[PDB]
Ligand binder design. Sequence first.
Ligand SMILES: COc1cc(/C=C/C(=O)O)ccc1O
Length: 367
Amino acid sequence: TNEITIGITVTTTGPAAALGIPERNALEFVAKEIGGHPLKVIVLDDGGDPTAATTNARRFVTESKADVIMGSSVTPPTVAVSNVANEAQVPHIALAPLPITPERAKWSVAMPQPIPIMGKVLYEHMKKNNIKTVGYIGYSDSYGDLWFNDLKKQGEAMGLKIVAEERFARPDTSVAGQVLKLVAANPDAILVGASGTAAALPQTSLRERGYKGLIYQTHGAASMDFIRIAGKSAEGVLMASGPVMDPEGQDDSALTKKPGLELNTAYEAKYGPNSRSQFAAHSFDAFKVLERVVPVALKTAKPGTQEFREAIRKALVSEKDIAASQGVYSFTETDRYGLDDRSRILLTVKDGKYVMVKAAALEHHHH
Ligand SMILES: COc1cc(/C=C/C(=O)O)ccc1O
């Protein structure tokens, strides 16, 4: 019963607050002790800023002597947190997608779906609905590149033609010049590689300028905020999402159904109708991971030692089929996401509501 120390850096101020506030809110609904030991959870805002997240992670690993760290809410500070964790040798659970490199693989795993699983479900839909040419607009940063690179690699391997690439910066409040080019090229479909508030900006700008192709969005867009902001321009979007957005529609055999119901009932009872989100689920699921790996680490090591950090690291890879709201996690030395087809669905928006268009893979089918 000495504590297990968890440092979390998430984005609860600035425009990425749309992603970090739900992550931080969902901590009300996670375990407060594991295996006899209380969880000391220290939460700090980073504003989405890579330097502030580096500062928080640094102080967690050296001053707080954290056993685990988590964060951040968007890809650039998440990269920064991974770099701290892999230097300091501390288990890191990422709460936003990030490029895994050998520099980051040893000490980091990631809760959000990896870009290629999400891209696959979008591009298969494009192929099935008569799309040949695709344009892109996304952030001029590492998340923007993940998505563009996946669109080029997977999409071209499926016979899609990528006819236009545009970028914008996160704080931009206008994409007039990029929308101008995209409308000119008039692709059959446009993939928007963005998140939260910023994801609704190319959505509205494109419709206001009379684009009439299909618009596709990533799982960075999967909260009610996108509908609140995009209004009617949201209609008929196609959006990749984790299954936590619709546990009701899952088969009772889905290992993700129960925990998704658990999170959403609590979250929405507090925060209101349709307040569920892709993002709240990541911190909830991170604590489901901890519930599996910590009792295993506790057999051979005490909280607050390097040996405990090492034991968690190993357990992340020895413990298979970890059921959570967003998927069933089996991490490996080389797969730091640990996810398969059970971790994604496709949503549309119809009359201001998300509707599931394509279900996650069934438990008793191939993955
Ligand atoms: C918080 O959860 C998520 C965040 C993002 C945001 C990416 C970015 O803007 O860098 C994408 C997918 C997620 O599941």
